[PDB]
């Protein structure tokens, strides 16, 4: 029952400062423009200890499956090859991606009927809000 409140199908309803977050990450112009337009569907499911997060969009579809605390390989929407670890900290999913000596942290939290995603790359935060689809 660890992620019960995250499970489901979610749709992006708002975004703030995502272009700047992507600039800090190192995303190029064209990918920032097209990725920034996307209105992804996030589908979160749990089967035993394995959590799956799928993102479906017009630009790219992504999928990760993982066990909490156990590092894995991820290919991001912008085609970075990263080493990721996802943990639960006080009811917040905390996702750290490492690549090329860089790091970004993505936090996912339930707040009211929303799933709030906070993405941080050095000093820059983007906040992305999802509602149930």
Ligand X SMILES: Cc1nc(-c2ccccc2)nc(Sc2ccc(F)cc2)c1C(=O)O
- Classify residue 122 as exposed, middle or buried by CB count within 10 Å of its CB (0-12, 13-18, 19+): exposed
After which residues is the backbone of the chain broken at C–N > 2.5 Å?
A: none
Residue 128 is labelled as binding a ligand: yes
Residue 125's CB is within 10 A of a number of other CB atoms, namely 16
d(CA 66, CA 87): 10
Q: What is the contact mask toward ligand X in residues 48 to 77, using x (rule: CB under 6 A)?
A: -------x-x-xx-x-------------xx
Q: Is residue 45 close enough to count as binding ligand X by CB under 6 A?
A: no
Residue list 77-96, contact with ligand X (CB under 6 A): 77-78
Nearest-CB residue for ligand X = 59
Which residues bind to ligand X, rule: CB under 6 A? 22, 25, 27, 35, 38, 40, 55, 57, 59-60, 62, 76-78, 106, 117, 119, 128
């Amino acid at each position: 029952h660890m992620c019960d409140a995250f499970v489901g199908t979610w749709k992006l309803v708002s975004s703030e400062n995502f272009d700047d977050y992507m600039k800090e990450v190192g995303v190029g112009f064209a990918t920032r423009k097209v990725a920034g337009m996307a209105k992804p569907n996030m589908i979160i499911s749990v089967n035993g200890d394995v959590i799956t997060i799928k993102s479906e969009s017009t630009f790219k579809n992504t999928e990760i499956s993982f066990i909490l605390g156990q590092e894995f390989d991820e290919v991001t929407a912008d085609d970075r090859k990263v080493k990721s670890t996802i943990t639960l900290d006080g009811g917040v999913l905390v996702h750290v991606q490492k690549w090329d000596g860089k790091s970004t942290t993505i936090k996912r939290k339930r707040e009211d009927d929303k799933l709030v995603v906070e993405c941080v790359m050095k000093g820059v935060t983007s906040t992305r809000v999802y509602e149930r689809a």
